[PDB]
Amino acid sequence: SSFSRAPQQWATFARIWYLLDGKMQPPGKLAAMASIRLQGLHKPVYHALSDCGDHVVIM
Amino acid sequence: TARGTPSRFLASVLHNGLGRYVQQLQRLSFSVSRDGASSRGAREFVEREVIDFARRNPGVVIYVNSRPCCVPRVVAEYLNGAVREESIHCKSVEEISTLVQKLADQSGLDVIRIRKPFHTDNPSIQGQWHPFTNKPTTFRGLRPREVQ
Amino acid sequence: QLSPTELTEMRNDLFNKEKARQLSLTPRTEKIEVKHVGKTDPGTVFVMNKNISTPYSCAMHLSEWYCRKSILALVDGQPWDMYKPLTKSCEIKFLTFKDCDPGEVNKAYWRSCAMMMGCVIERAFKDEYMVNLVRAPEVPVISGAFCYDVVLDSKLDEWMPTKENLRSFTKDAHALIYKDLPFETLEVEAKVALEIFQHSKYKVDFIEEKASQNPERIVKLHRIGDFIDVSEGPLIPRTSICFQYEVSAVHNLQPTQPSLIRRFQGVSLPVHLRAHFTIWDKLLERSRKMVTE
Amino acid sequence: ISRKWEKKNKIVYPPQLPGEPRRPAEIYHCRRQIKYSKDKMWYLAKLIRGMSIDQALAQLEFNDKKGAKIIKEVLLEAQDMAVRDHNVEFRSNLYIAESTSGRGQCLKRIRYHGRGRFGIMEKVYCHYFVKLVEGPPPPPEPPKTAVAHAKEYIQQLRSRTIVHTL
Amino acid sequence: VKKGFRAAFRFQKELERQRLLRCPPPPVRRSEKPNWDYHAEIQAFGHRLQENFSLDLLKTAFVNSCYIKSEEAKRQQLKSNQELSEQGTSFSQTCLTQFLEDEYPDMPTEGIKNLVDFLTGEEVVCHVARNLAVEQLTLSEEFPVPPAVLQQTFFAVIGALLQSSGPERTALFIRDFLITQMTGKELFEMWKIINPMGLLVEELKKRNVSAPESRLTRQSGGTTALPLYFVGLYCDKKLIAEGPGETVLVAEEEAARVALRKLYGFTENRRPWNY
Amino acid sequence: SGTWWDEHLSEENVPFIKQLVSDEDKAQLASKLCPLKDEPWPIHPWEPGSFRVGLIALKLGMMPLWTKDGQKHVVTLLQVQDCHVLKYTSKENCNGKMATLSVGGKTVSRFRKATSILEFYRELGLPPKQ
Amino acid sequence: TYSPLPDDYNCNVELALTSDGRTIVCYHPSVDIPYEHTKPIPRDQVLKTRLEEKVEHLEEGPMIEQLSKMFFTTKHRWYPHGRYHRCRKNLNPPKDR
């Protein structure tokens, strides 16, 4: 990518603000995909000590 | 134990083997005694095997000190300022040859726990993954539910 | 014409070279004897260094309490600055705010606060406009406010400061108090004070009248950091002596011609005599009221 | 027993070059075999740690403890030896760097209980150690700011690496 | 008192090593350390570097002027480095500039010069000399060897190798022991710049390219304390660079640095050096 | 070092300060006695479902009281010392379904109140309430 | 007209097999962000513009709750640690690339 080390690290480990809708959705399915996104299990750089969670906004 | 001992990463001394290989052993000091039954094996090693080793390794300076001592020792000095003091007390000539050769093939870095048994300085070629990898762009870069 | 920055470092350079000249005039160490004749710890002899030692050095010999409470020093009966070097073997007596007759300490405090407010004004008004400092009138403590006379720009001949402007002046004074600068003192020749303050006709007139009143034409200069001013007498040791400070009011003097002289009035109280909020507000209102000399 | 505090006072230094800081004076003093508990003397020493010498003397003069009086005497004689032998310029220009209390040699006496039972009393003794350093007392460490807390959080976040991979 | 000698001797050794760890000795040169033989060390230096040095040239390359001055002073109570050091330094500048501008034809002269000054700089050359044990063979006045002295001694060794073996052989030596130091580092980690946007607009102007436009390609957060900005630099509606940052300005600066990297040929995925 | 209001005051200045602050407090009460003449807020008629403000009274004591069937009831005397509505908060501003009104009671010493308290009451033009 | 994956987020991937069928050749040039898909860049008369340096000192509770609201954490990250952990922490950690 030819980034510098600190911007490259910031870009890799930055947080994302995902949006999710209710409106006749099942809360268990909402909760499953929200739980994956909150843990950060959707990232290939995931590790439990890396604090790689993302924000999820459910309306 | 890993938690009770230091650790480091896999490394070379000065990018060794990239342009050329430089033997990291620099000096071998053999304290041996003339009359020691503990030093008999090192006496045989000085008699027979040290000449061929010194010829095979011209970059290593080998000092042999015959002095009254109870425990014969070898001190290996490595190019990065490393010092390894090892007892060759009551070892046969082939055990001493194995040990001295092993010292020759070592590098000066610590024999401690090595995390991550590989070391690259350019881990990615296509670009390291960031979240916006594998994410499509949007017309005018609009955020979700932007009123424009 | 010299910029405000460059007139500042040239004045600082002249002050430093004169101080170095006095220290070179006293090159060898010399022992003087100081007889503390105060009511407390009576008859105490110090053997101080000549033209290096201070009444603060004597107080530091005695105890920390004398350093923290001693605001002025009586050297042979005359008021002496706490950081002014001693010249002759004398008798000393430390003066605090809470004595039976603290009048000299009060005069030093009010003069110090006036000089601090003058520094605040000079470094508060803008580069495109012109500031000149006339003098600090020796106004009594009973009046309620310190006055500094400033000649301002003809572009600001009509301008009146607002409440936020006065609070900005107060914030700058509190910034000086927080910076906690010592009041450096120099007894200097009238000629030397003249080339220091040569770009101010009012300062030249003031220096000339002080040189007229004393025989040897020696005047007193004081410095807090980079601001240098001519003083009527001794000052307090450090700006951190001031605790409650406010630049209350700004007024025009009655003769507008030939030039408009604006009297800045402020009120202050030291740490050792800090007042309550309500009493301080009443002192604020009286300081906002007019003070005439 | 050991008297290394007194030997620390008798340590000497080489002469000073004219172009380096002034190396402020250090004065070591101790009192041994004080009929007092080392824990209570610890409370008094932890009171006077890091104070100026006059501040410590004021606090010990208006404290209400036998240990406070004893430590006040030790501090006064340490100040006297400071500006009598160690070339301290001003007697107020000292602060307490180290102030701690240690155990002394105690004695075992019997304490008669009920029945035929008994206990062992301990005639407790203690030492007091003090170190005076020339100069103003060091400023107290300012409390951590929200700017510094945000800074250290950002430094951890930028020190994160991708673990268990190339 | 328990009988015996072995436990007491072992505890004496334990006490000695604990005393050494509590009060460490001052550092002393390997010459005054016991096992030492200067001629053997010089021969082993040449042989482990696999170079056919001239022995007198190597000894004169290790002799410094400060050691000369200290040893007359000790006499009152021969050849220095300077010619060999100047030859080695000049050959290092010329040869390194040649390697750099042949491998990277698109760098301008300022960048080639800055890379050469990094490779012949104090830190890199002293690191190479220390881990090649030039310091152990260096005759000087003070220990540890001052970094200027060590750099001068290393370049005197380069000059001795040039005089003994030839320009191609010492070119191989310089290639190895300095391009291996250049290996793992980034262009603006070696050559410090101030205004990458200014350098980029100057380069695009001198190669006849319209001035770049910064645009917000990607954005996350924005109102929080941890924002993420990808700023893309475009030219004639065509992307030339992209860069991340925590703020918009630092993202734009990083995009300018990425543009400079791509234009100059120092990209992370460039072809590695051929050894 | 801790300080109180009359620490650095002389015997001549203590009663003067006391008299001055007492006269100021009585003047402020006299100024605040005429709200309707000053400027009323819009007075609205009582609508069902409305809730008006209460007050703060000092518990004075207890007294007997007989009712016309000859029956005794003991009553509590609560004295309204000085009630003053001091602050209004809108329904949007307060985290509640109803708006709020703050009422202050017994007059106390400015010397023994805190600084933010003193600034609040100085802006209101009233002496501080207990 | 067939693509195994959508071809608009990372790279235009084309799979191929050599004539002997012994190796698989992948061609994946990167996709570039379109200009139209981007977004344009975001944008006292008489005294000094005195520098507005106020630093209010919040006590520990308000300071920690403000930090927690800022960074979306709990309070336990911001509460301090003892000397045992502070001196157990490694101040010279190993560093690879």
PDB file of N, CA and C in Angstrom, chain C residues 178-220:
ATOM      1  N   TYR C 178       0.414  34.088  37.883  1.00  0.00           N
ATOM      2  CA  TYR C 178       0.706  32.663  37.763  1.00  0.00           C
ATOM      3  C   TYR C 178       2.134  32.425  37.285  1.00  0.00           C
ATOM      4  N   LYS C 179       2.649  33.303  36.417  1.00  0.00           N
ATOM      5  CA  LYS C 179       4.022  33.150  35.947  1.00  0.00           C
ATOM      6  C   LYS C 179       5.035  33.413  37.052  1.00  0.00           C
ATOM      7  N   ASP C 180       4.674  34.239  38.043  1.00  0.00           N
ATOM      8  CA  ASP C 180       5.423  34.375  39.302  1.00  0.00           C
ATOM      9  C   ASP C 180       6.854  34.867  39.046  1.00  0.00           C
ATOM     10  N   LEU C 181       6.925  36.076  38.588  1.00  0.00           N
ATOM     11  CA  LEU C 181       8.234  36.621  38.268  1.00  0.00           C
ATOM     12  C   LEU C 181       8.789  37.426  39.440  1.00  0.00           C
ATOM     13  N   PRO C 182      10.097  37.367  39.679  1.00  0.00           N
ATOM     14  CA  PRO C 182      10.686  38.202  40.730  1.00  0.00           C
ATOM     15  C   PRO C 182      10.793  39.651  40.290  1.00  0.00           C
ATOM     16  N   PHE C 183      10.721  40.551  41.268  1.00  0.00           N
ATOM     17  CA  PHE C 183      10.831  41.986  41.016  1.00  0.00           C
ATOM     18  C   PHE C 183      12.304  42.358  41.104  1.00  0.00           C
ATOM     19  N   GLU C 184      12.989  42.307  39.966  1.00  0.00           N
ATOM     20  CA  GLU C 184      14.404  42.652  39.938  1.00  0.00           C
ATOM     21  C   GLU C 184      14.584  44.159  40.047  1.00  0.00           C
ATOM     22  N   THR C 185      15.575  44.570  40.835  1.00  0.00           N
ATOM     23  CA  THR C 185      15.814  45.968  41.162  1.00  0.00           C
ATOM     24  C   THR C 185      17.192  46.390  40.669  1.00  0.00           C
ATOM     25  N   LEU C 186      17.289  47.633  40.200  1.00  0.00           N
ATOM     26  CA  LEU C 186      18.574  48.196  39.805  1.00  0.00           C
ATOM     27  C   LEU C 186      18.612  49.673  40.165  1.00  0.00           C
ATOM     28  N   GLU C 187      19.582  50.053  40.993  1.00  0.00           N
ATOM     29  CA  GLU C 187      19.908  51.454  41.226  1.00  0.00           C
ATOM     30  C   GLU C 187      20.870  51.887  40.128  1.00  0.00           C
ATOM     31  N   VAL C 188      20.452  52.843  39.299  1.00  0.00           N
ATOM     32  CA  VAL C 188      21.142  53.100  38.044  1.00  0.00           C
ATOM     33  C   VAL C 188      21.372  54.599  37.886  1.00  0.00           C
ATOM     34  N   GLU C 189      22.360  54.937  37.059  1.00  0.00           N
ATOM     35  CA  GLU C 189      22.643  56.324  36.726  1.00  0.00           C
ATOM     36  C   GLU C 189      21.541  56.906  35.844  1.00  0.00           C
ATOM     37  N   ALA C 190      21.307  58.215  36.014  1.00  0.00           N
ATOM     38  CA  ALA C 190      20.268  58.912  35.259  1.00  0.00           C
ATOM     39  C   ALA C 190      20.552  58.894  33.767  1.00  0.00           C
ATOM     40  N   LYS C 191      21.822  59.032  33.381  1.00  0.00           N
ATOM     41  CA  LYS C 191      22.174  58.886  31.973  1.00  0.00           C
ATOM     42  C   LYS C 191      21.747  57.517  31.455  1.00  0.00           C
ATOM     43  N   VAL C 192      22.104  56.447  32.178  1.00  0.00           N
ATOM     44  CA  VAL C 192      21.802  55.092  31.726  1.00  0.00           C
ATOM     45  C   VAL C 192      20.293  54.871  31.610  1.00  0.00           C
ATOM     46  N   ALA C 193      19.518  55.374  32.583  1.00  0.00           N
ATOM     47  CA  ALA C 193      18.060  55.312  32.470  1.00  0.00           C
ATOM     48  C   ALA C 193      17.563  56.104  31.265  1.00  0.00           C
ATOM     49  N   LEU C 194      18.267  57.186  30.910  1.00  0.00           N
ATOM     50  CA  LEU C 194      17.865  57.980  29.752  1.00  0.00           C
ATOM     51  C   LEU C 194      18.047  57.212  28.437  1.00  0.00           C
ATOM     52  N   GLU C 195      19.196  56.534  28.227  1.00  0.00           N
ATOM     53  CA  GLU C 195      19.253  55.762  26.969  1.00  0.00           C
ATOM     54  C   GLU C 195      18.402  54.500  27.034  1.00  0.00           C
ATOM     55  N   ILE C 196      18.042  54.030  28.228  1.00  0.00           N
ATOM     56  CA  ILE C 196      17.106  52.911  28.284  1.00  0.00           C
ATOM     57  C   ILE C 196      15.721  53.356  27.824  1.00  0.00           C
ATOM     58  N   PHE C 197      15.247  54.491  28.331  1.00  0.00           N
ATOM     59  CA  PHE C 197      13.909  54.991  28.035  1.00  0.00           C
ATOM     60  C   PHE C 197      13.945  56.189  27.090  1.00  0.00           C
ATOM     61  N   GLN C 198      14.869  56.170  26.124  1.00  0.00           N
ATOM     62  CA  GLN C 198      15.013  57.304  25.216  1.00  0.00           C
ATOM     63  C   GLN C 198      13.839  57.429  24.248  1.00  0.00           C
ATOM     64  N   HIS C 199      13.137  56.337  23.954  1.00  0.00           N
ATOM     65  CA  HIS C 199      11.976  56.424  23.067  1.00  0.00           C
ATOM     66  C   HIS C 199      10.674  56.591  23.847  1.00  0.00           C
ATOM     67  N   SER C 200      10.674  57.504  24.822  1.00  0.00           N
ATOM     68  CA  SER C 200       9.460  57.870  25.554  1.00  0.00           C
ATOM     69  C   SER C 200       9.723  59.200  26.249  1.00  0.00           C
ATOM     70  N   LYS C 201       9.082  60.273  25.772  1.00  0.00           N
ATOM     71  CA  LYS C 201       9.343  61.606  26.316  1.00  0.00           C
ATOM     72  C   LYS C 201       8.845  61.751  27.755  1.00  0.00           C
ATOM     73  N   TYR C 202       7.731  61.095  28.088  1.00  0.00           N
ATOM     74  CA  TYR C 202       7.188  61.111  29.447  1.00  0.00           C
ATOM     75  C   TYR C 202       8.110  60.369  30.412  1.00  0.00           C
ATOM     76  N   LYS C 203       8.673  59.239  29.967  1.00  0.00           N
ATOM     77  CA  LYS C 203       9.653  58.533  30.785  1.00  0.00           C
ATOM     78  C   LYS C 203      10.924  59.356  30.949  1.00  0.00           C
ATOM     79  N   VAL C 204      11.318  60.096  29.906  1.00  0.00           N
ATOM     80  CA  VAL C 204      12.462  61.003  30.018  1.00  0.00           C
ATOM     81  C   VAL C 204      12.193  62.097  31.047  1.00  0.00           C
ATOM     82  N   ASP C 205      10.992  62.683  31.022  1.00  0.00           N
ATOM     83  CA  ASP C 205      10.644  63.723  31.992  1.00  0.00           C
ATOM     84  C   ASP C 205      10.615  63.172  33.415  1.00  0.00           C
ATOM     85  N   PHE C 206      10.066  61.966  33.589  1.00  0.00           N
ATOM     86  CA  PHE C 206      10.025  61.350  34.913  1.00  0.00           C
ATOM     87  C   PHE C 206      11.426  61.034  35.428  1.00  0.00           C
ATOM     88  N   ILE C 207      12.283  60.477  34.566  1.00  0.00           N
ATOM     89  CA  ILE C 207      13.660  60.172  34.948  1.00  0.00           C
ATOM     90  C   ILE C 207      14.409  61.452  35.292  1.00  0.00           C
ATOM     91  N   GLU C 208      14.155  62.523  34.534  1.00  0.00           N
ATOM     92  CA  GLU C 208      14.803  63.802  34.797  1.00  0.00           C
ATOM     93  C   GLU C 208      14.363  64.394  36.129  1.00  0.00           C
ATOM     94  N   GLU C 209      13.077  64.275  36.476  1.00  0.00           N
ATOM     95  CA  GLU C 209      12.646  64.832  37.757  1.00  0.00           C
ATOM     96  C   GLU C 209      13.143  63.992  38.935  1.00  0.00           C
ATOM     97  N   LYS C 210      13.276  62.670  38.761  1.00  0.00           N
ATOM     98  CA  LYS C 210      13.880  61.865  39.826  1.00  0.00           C
ATOM     99  C   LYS C 210      15.367  62.178  39.982  1.00  0.00           C
ATOM    100  N   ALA C 211      16.064  62.400  38.865  1.00  0.00           N
ATOM    101  CA  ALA C 211      17.461  62.812  38.930  1.00  0.00           C
ATOM    102  C   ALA C 211      17.608  64.209  39.515  1.00  0.00           C
ATOM    103  N   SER C 212      16.587  65.054  39.357  1.00  0.00           N
ATOM    104  CA  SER C 212      16.617  66.374  39.975  1.00  0.00           C
ATOM    105  C   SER C 212      16.432  66.282  41.483  1.00  0.00           C
ATOM    106  N   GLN C 213      15.498  65.441  41.941  1.00  0.00           N
ATOM    107  CA  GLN C 213      15.256  65.361  43.381  1.00  0.00           C
ATOM    108  C   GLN C 213      16.392  64.652  44.111  1.00  0.00           C
ATOM    109  N   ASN C 214      17.136  63.683  43.408  1.00  0.00           N
ATOM    110  CA  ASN C 214      18.213  63.215  44.279  1.00  0.00           C
ATOM    111  C   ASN C 214      19.557  63.810  43.848  1.00  0.00           C
ATOM    112  N   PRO C 215      20.533  63.941  44.762  1.00  0.00           N
ATOM    113  CA  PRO C 215      21.791  64.616  44.383  1.00  0.00           C
ATOM    114  C   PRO C 215      22.640  63.859  43.373  1.00  0.00           C
ATOM    115  N   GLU C 216      22.756  62.540  43.502  1.00  0.00           N
ATOM    116  CA  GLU C 216      23.666  61.764  42.669  1.00  0.00           C
ATOM    117  C   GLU C 216      23.049  61.331  41.345  1.00  0.00           C
ATOM    118  N   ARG C 217      21.787  61.701  41.092  1.00  0.00           N
ATOM    119  CA  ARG C 217      21.052  61.348  39.872  1.00  0.00           C
ATOM    120  C   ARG C 217      21.007  59.833  39.664  1.00  0.00           C
ATOM    121  N   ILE C 218      20.678  59.117  40.735  1.00  0.00           N
ATOM    122  CA  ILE C 218      20.503  57.669  40.714  1.00  0.00           C
ATOM    123  C   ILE C 218      19.015  57.381  40.841  1.00  0.00           C
ATOM    124  N   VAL C 219      18.458  56.679  39.862  1.00  0.00           N
ATOM    125  CA  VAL C 219      17.049  56.325  39.872  1.00  0.00           C
ATOM    126  C   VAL C 219      16.917  54.814  40.039  1.00  0.00           C
ATOM    127  N   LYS C 220      15.681  54.366  40.237  1.00  0.00           N
ATOM    128  CA  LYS C 220      15.380  52.971  40.531  1.00  0.00           C
ATOM    129  C   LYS C 220      14.597  52.369  39.374  1.00  0.00           C
TER     130      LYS C 220
END
